Design a protein around this ligand. Sequence first.
Ligand SMILES: Cc1cc2nc3c(=O)[nH]c(=O)nc-3n(C[C@H](O)[C@H](O)[C@H](O)COP(=O)(O)OP(=O)(O)OC[C@H]3O[C@@H](n4cnc5c(N)ncnc54)[C@H](O)[C@@H]3O)c2cc1C
Ligand SMILES: Cc1cc2nc3c(=O)[nH]c(=O)nc-3n(C[C@H](O)[C@H](O)[C@H](O)COP(=O)(O)OP(=O)(O)OC[C@H]3O[C@@H](n4cnc5c(N)ncnc54)[C@H](O)[C@@H]3O)c2cc1C
Ligand SMILES: COC(=O)[C@@H]1C[C@@H](O)CN1C(=O)c1ccco1
Ligand SMILES: COC(=O)[C@@H]1C[C@@H](O)CN1C(=O)c1ccco1
Ligand SMILES: [Br-]
Ligand SMILES: [Mg+2]
Ligand SMILES: [Mg+2]
Lengths: 486, 483
Amino acid sequence: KAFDLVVIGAGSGGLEAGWNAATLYGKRVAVVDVQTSHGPPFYAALGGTCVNVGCVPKKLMVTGAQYMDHLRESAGFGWEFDGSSVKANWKKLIAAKNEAVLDINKSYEGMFNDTEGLDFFLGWGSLESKNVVVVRETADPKSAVKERLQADHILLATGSWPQMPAIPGIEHCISSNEAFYLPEPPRRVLTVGGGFISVEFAGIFNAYKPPGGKVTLCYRNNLILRGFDETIREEVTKQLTANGIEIMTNENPAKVSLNTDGSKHVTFESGKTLDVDVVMMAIGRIPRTNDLQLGNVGVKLTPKGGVQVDEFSRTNVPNIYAIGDITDRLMLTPVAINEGAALVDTVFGNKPRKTDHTRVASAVFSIPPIGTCGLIEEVAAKEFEKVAVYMSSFTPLMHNISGSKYKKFVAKIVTNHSDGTVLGVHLLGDGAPEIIQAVGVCLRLNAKISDFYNTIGVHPTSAEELCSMRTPSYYYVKGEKMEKLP
Amino acid sequence: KAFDLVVIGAGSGGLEAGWNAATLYGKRVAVVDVQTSHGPPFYAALGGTCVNVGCVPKKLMVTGAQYMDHLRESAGFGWEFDGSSVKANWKKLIAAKNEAVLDINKSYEGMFNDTEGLDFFLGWGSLESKNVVVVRETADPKSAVKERLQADHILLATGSWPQMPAIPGIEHCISSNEAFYLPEPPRRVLTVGGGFISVEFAGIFNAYKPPGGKVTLCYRNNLILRGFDETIREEVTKQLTANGIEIMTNENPAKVSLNTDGSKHVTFESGKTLDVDVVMMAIGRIPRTNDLQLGNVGVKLTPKGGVQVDEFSRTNVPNIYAIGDITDRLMLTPVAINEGAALVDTVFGNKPRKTDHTRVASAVFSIPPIGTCGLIEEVAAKEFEKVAVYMSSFTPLMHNISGSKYKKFVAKIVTNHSDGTVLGVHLLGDGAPEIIQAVGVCLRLNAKISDFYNTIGVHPTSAEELCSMRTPSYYYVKGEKME
Ligand SMILES: Cc1cc2nc3c(=O)[nH]c(=O)nc-3n(C[C@H](O)[C@H](O)[C@H](O)COP(=O)(O)OP(=O)(O)OC[C@H]3O[C@@H](n4cnc5c(N)ncnc54)[C@H](O)[C@@H]3O)c2cc1C
Ligand SMILES: Cc1cc2nc3c(=O)[nH]c(=O)nc-3n(C[C@H](O)[C@H](O)[C@H](O)COP(=O)(O)OP(=O)(O)OC[C@H]3O[C@@H](n4cnc5c(N)ncnc54)[C@H](O)[C@@H]3O)c2cc1C
Ligand SMILES: COC(=O)[C@@H]1C[C@@H](O)CN1C(=O)c1ccco1
Ligand SMILES: COC(=O)[C@@H]1C[C@@H](O)CN1C(=O)c1ccco1
Ligand SMILES: [Br-]
Ligand SMILES: [Mg+2]
Ligand SMILES: [Mg+2]
């Protein structure tokens, strides 16, 4: 019952820290999670949110959703078939996703069996004391102890959970957790929220809806995807609309009731109403701190609710660290993994390393998708006296032939115009998530715009647009947008 | 008529050079090409090989070919439709391709009409003297003179042309040029060659083949795609085979005759026989210098027929330059364009610049495709004492579900293990040509493996594999492979 490291949460960050500590530094590791495989009741399980009810199944389902566009687009290239015979079998998709997620769950079980020092414990981890984690039967702190784990080092890696707004009839609504297990594809669905999860699910439901279906996405403010490039926010909005999704901006559910046929009657704050089969809330995710009983050792939380951490993932309590979504910063898997890898290389490697929270590449698997790294221009413009924006936006040739004329590719480079340093790169279109990864490496290397334009293009690709931009489209001078410099 | 620059060949490199010299440096520029729009009889035309019978139309046709996989793969994600209704209409693909290419032809026509100091001349350009380009009716130097252009500076930018082996029945075979104009998709086709053109057309013809059809690729050597990463050469062979293409390595055509039904009877050196509807020779491209009458001026050619150039694209004759395929080096459009821009900056801008032919990102639009930049490990191992290989190879999850379990993604990083400098990056799988572009920028910035593995991944992507490799798979020490 004695460990160098006890990790609460067998997720993206938890397993990276766990595995590394064991395989690289031959350390003695305990990892706690509430479930060994995906789905109800606790949804996240061994592997974490990403594996079970996040990046992995979502990406399989977006890939499934993309075939609605490929089947149509094929016609431009001479593919002929009976379009009246086309059906999207959601039940197939969910069964194939479940098998793929289960195989990963089994994979992690394999990893824990086949690794000296690395041991998995089932149940609910909380903090007894500075150096003891208790595993109980349930999330109730009164439930039975299954284990008392002695820890020289404790890692909090419990991730996040969907926020459900406290409106009348919220019990008629689901989150992404339940979206992954719907037995039938909804004919009419309201996705609530303007972030990546609402956007990605609107695309998924749009592809799998039965005949006479309608996807509506509502967002409480004016323009979806706050924090992304503004040109891309506007374009994603147009491209989702072009593919049949209704975007209701400046709208927010005030209440939901069940109609007598089991459908949902949504009343908006504005007084508008909408009948749907599913209401999926995707308005936020909040760190999972309640169940850890952090009051028992006095781990400090932020005004927001995340575990407060320094640059080395250290809480206010020596030997207690926190990575990933529990810190309520950038809620992405590779960030959690990076923080985990750094924490272990630091503490057990004697090789201190801090995660860089700048210049993080990320994606939205919207149809079509977003790839982005670094600052949007409005943010750059407040930090840098002179910012240049390089922009290329056009419908690629393939999509003129496919008939998807609305699929404008957007490539934007934001620079410090004083030295040419690239501050951010913002892509919308097929392949954007793949294109952006090596751009993340470019930004780590302090690439300038001249490093891009002096590189020889790969032709023909969308990516070569990033190496063809020599002249700013416009600038910000002391925060002020203008076409030309003074 | 008198010009600062005369460009023979209105192609990738010629147009970059002409447009830059006219617009950036205010020079009076003439550009010569044999045809104003794509296709027979001369195939290349205004815009060049890439526009007319190269990168642009081939990428559209590979995109078309990819739908065979998407339609099949859709089933794993629950898509249902009547498979027996599926037809690949090649006529529609060719029509869509022709319209796209002709629009580009027309836009280039409009660029010349609307750019003052940039003039287009139709016909066959050759050298009369070191400062005179003659434009004639035909490739025959006795054909009628249309123009004589006085030139301070002459750029040779005539590209390359398919190589056809001098075998009996060569006349019954075609090249890529004719493949772009086949009115009907061949039921049985043999692509001859192991290079990108053979492999890309094998995938195109494999998707559009009518029922009961068969695509065969033959190559003289043991393993297609020499010059590419060896793991990728092996895997792309497996993945082509898995999609129904017959790869005949260590085989070469000895002759072709017509069966009585007009189909092609191929006899290989090995005494194997194959009956096909089309034989497409893709064994090589040779520099197009014959028609230039370079003997009029004494421009030095290689025995192969390439124009010899220094690093600044200068021939042995002052004021005569050559860029692009005619130089018989790296036969890529972006390289031709880079060389044209560097030449004009140097000559007209006094901004001396030479093209870097190292660490050039390129792609093969095979199905699935290749993206590469920099050295393969066998080459690195001869130039560096210690070389590390970081390799990740696995069927991605979407392809377990899709039913294309054969589709392994390969990601390989080759380093100088002495300092970690990345020497090469080699990718096989969907997205590879898009992933490799920004890797080009990384290699220009002398990125080390640590710069890749300390970059935060984008998940889920194939690209994130590049940023997830901490530990070498194997090494070369003084040219020798060590596990
Ligand atoms: C729908 C969706 C889509 C997403 N898509 C992407 C994407 O494409 N790319 C991306 O990078 N990120 C994506 N994310 C975010 C990603 O899932 C998270 O950022 C990441 O999983 C956070 O990792 P973590 O280590 O913080 O915790 P998690 O991976 O969430 O692991 C936490 C684990 O802790 C366990 N746990 C919690 N409380 C306790 C307790 N008291 N005792 C024991 N175990 C406990 C849970 O069961 C869970 O398995 C997505 C998220 C969602 C919900
Ligand atoms: C099937 C195929 C696929 C390819 N795919 C790709 C790819 O995906 N990516 C890539 O980067 N590269 C690709 N390439 C290579 C690319 O097309 C060439 O590298 C590029 O076009 C060479 O440019 P250039 O300026 O040297 O000549 P070109 O673009 O070939 O232009 C030469 C021009 O000169 C004209 N001409 C010739 N002789 C005369 C004369 N005497 N007088 C007047 N005009 C003349 C021709 O009509 C032609 O238009 C491909 C090539 C082929 C054949
Ligand atoms: C693509 O990842 C996201 O959408 C992340 C995850 C969560 O932290 C919310 N979020 C953002 O707001 C955002 C803006 C730009 C990039 O990310
Ligand atoms: C995609 O780029 C290529 O395929 C280029 C184009 C042409 O130059 C041949 N080639 C090679 O790289 C090569 C080396 C040895 C055999 O082919
Ligand atoms: Br070989
Ligand atoms: Mg174990
Ligand atoms: Mg003109």
